[PDB]
Amino acid sequence: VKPISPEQEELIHRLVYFQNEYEQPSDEDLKRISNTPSEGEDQSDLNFRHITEITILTVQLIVEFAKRLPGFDKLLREDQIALLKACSSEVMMLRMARRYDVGSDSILFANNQPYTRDSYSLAGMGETVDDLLRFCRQMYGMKVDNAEYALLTAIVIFSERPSLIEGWKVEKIQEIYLEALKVYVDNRRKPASGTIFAKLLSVLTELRTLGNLNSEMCFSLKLKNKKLPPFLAEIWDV
Amino acid sequence: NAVANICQATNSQLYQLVEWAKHIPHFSSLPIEDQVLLLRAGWNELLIAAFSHRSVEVRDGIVLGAGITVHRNSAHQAGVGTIFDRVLTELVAKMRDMNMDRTELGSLRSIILFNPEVRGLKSGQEVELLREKVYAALEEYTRVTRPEEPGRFAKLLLRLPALRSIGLKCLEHLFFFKLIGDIPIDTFLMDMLGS
Ligand SMILES: CC(C)CC[C@@H](O)[C@](C)(O)[C@H]1CC[C@@]2(O)C3=CC(=O)[C@@H]4C[C@@H](O)[C@@H](O)C[C@]4(C)[C@H]3CC[C@]12C
Ligand SMILES: CCN1C(=O)C=CC1=O
């Protein structure tokens, strides 16, 4: 029954704004990706190339979003890098869930090309795709909106990670986004907001597992004689 | 400090784990296959949560049972060598700082146990309803018991991701290898669950 404070409304407005602002790669980058078919490559090599090369842009977008969150500039550079490295994959899972299409049971990429189970399988990434799509489905079933996604992303970014220097400050920043999420959920979900707050916080727990599942590729790739782009390899300690 | 005693302790932890699950309200009324699945999935998180919470009184150590507390030098020999540090840092220290009581620990572990996202369930909706009941109850309890701190519910819930991460450092079911027979884990669970 407790209402949103004006500061919290400003915060949420900023979050929604940033999320919309850094949601898609530039048309230039995408056009550059579609227009480099190297040498007569097969459908598989094409799918893999698109998935990885776009994933690079996705990570860059994640950084752009993170460095604009209130609180982020209060941290030591070391802790910023640590957080980003540790959370980029999870945030990536949320971004992916935001582009899930129920009807086709597929993920719609920024180039409007739908990627299905078979797209990923053909790319060489079949071992994990069902878990990915299942997360997308669960997420969809919760009917999560823009503010909730933004706030969740902020909360994921400011989570406790190994090798933090000022972990307490991170925790303190995270508290604010938690409370904003709780109040938002209280005031803007109908008829009430039974347990949807805790239900949203379970998403974090699942994101740990998914992040592990994303680290757990690239050994699978090496076994298939395939290769992560070096940026991603470094960023995910692979 | 001795091997055999540690083994006895951890085995006892397993038995106690199953006993605890058995007496959580509405759990034993689920189809037994579902109980086996839920316990298999939560096995590590549940154990780790329990002994983390038992380790708060002790300093720089993990209590694994009656008169058996393990420090870093013996951690590997105890079977906890790989998660020792993160357990002390993200769990024990945290449980101590915020004074996590037993009702809250039980709530959290209930939440872990009642995971409707576990694959292969028959009664998934029922499990979800149970988890929801636990959420509501826990929020109520923290709202009443400690009203001075309004961010306590979320702070408790934030230990669940930490538990999942630490539990994942284990590519095996914790302590199971020190049971005596060649009894498979599903058989051990089936036997220990059915009356
Ligand atoms: C190892 C790695 C490369 C695999 C990671 C993969 O499993 C993921 C999680 O499946 C990757 C692959 C493609 C992917 O990067 C995306 C493509 C898009 O076009 C868009 C670009 C950008 O607007 C994002 O907000 C959403 C989306 C859909 C992202 C999400 C994450 C995806 C979907
Ligand atoms: C076998 C290695 N290991 C540990 O040391 C603690 C959990 C585990 O699986």
TrEMBL record, chain A:
<protein>
    <recommendedName>
        <fullName>Ecdysone receptor</fullName>
    </recommendedName>
</protein>
<comment type="similarity">
    <text>Belongs to the nuclear hormone receptor family. NR1 subfamily.</text>
</comment>
<feature type="domain" description="NR LBD">
    <location>
        <begin position="7"/>
        <end position="238"/>
    </location>
</feature>
UniProtKB/TrEMBL annotation, chain B:
<protein>
    <recommendedName>
        <fullName>Nuclear receptor subfamily 2 group B member 4</fullName>
    </recommendedName>
</protein>
<comment type="similarity">
    <text>Belongs to the nuclear hormone receptor family. NR2 subfamily.</text>
</comment>
<feature type="domain" description="NR LBD">
    <location>
        <begin position="1"/>
        <end position="195"/>
    </location>
</feature>
